[PDB]
Design a protein around this ligand. Structure first.
Ligand code: 7B7
Length: 164
């Protein structure tokens, strides 16, 4: 079936717990595979040690720039950027997992987890999974954001990988 992956997240060095994500490889196999491999680190790089750099309460938590650790970077397993696979899945509510981007066809590694329905992103960001377990952790992360997106604690993906 579809991959299940995990992110273990700290805030200021204290563990918050685990976010488990289903990756909808049935719908967006290329996008799912990228995220899966970045979780395992099997290509020699990935999310381990990277941060949630932009967190906006009542919107989303954004992470995954493991190259510049500032929100301008990240890379995919295919190369620096890859195309928008499709817009078949929608930003339906809290827990949606979607690719950050800098315009059409600029998926890399940055991603976000929604904390509300973000319908205005439909057709612009590729949705590729959702939270299976750990929305409590996501709500904790969210609570350390701000209107500007600046985080008030250092939020780090300490560990990540594939469950199935
Ligand atoms: C204030 O944040 C947003 C406002 C409107 C639309 C989207 C966003 C944020 C949160 C949801 C995802 N998102 C973005 O992707 C904004 N763009 C972004 O952060 N671009 C940096 C970037 C650089 C390279 C790559 N590969 C991906 C993203």
């Amino acid at each position: 079936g579809n991959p299940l992956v995990y992110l273990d997240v700290d805030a200021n060095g204290k563990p918050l717990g685990r976010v488990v994500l289903e990756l909808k490889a049935d719908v967006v196999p290329k996008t799912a595979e990228n995220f899966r491999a970045l979780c395992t680190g099997e290509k020699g790089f990935g999310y381990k040690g990277s941060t949630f750099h932009r967190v906006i309460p009542s919107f989303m938590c954004q992470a995954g720039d493991f190259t510049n650790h500032n929100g301008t970077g990240g890379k995919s397993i295919y190369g620096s950027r890859f195309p928008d696979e499709n817009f078949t899945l929608k930003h339906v509510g809290p827990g949606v997992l979607s690719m950050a981007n800098a315009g059409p066809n600029t998926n890399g590694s940055q991603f976000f987890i929604c904390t509300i329905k973000t319908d205005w992103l439909d057709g612009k960001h590729v949705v590729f999974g959702h939270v299976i377990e750990g929305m409590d952790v996501v709500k904790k992360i969210e609570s350390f954001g701000s209107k500007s997106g600046r985080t008030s604690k250092k939020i780090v993906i300490t560990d990540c990988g594939q469950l199935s």
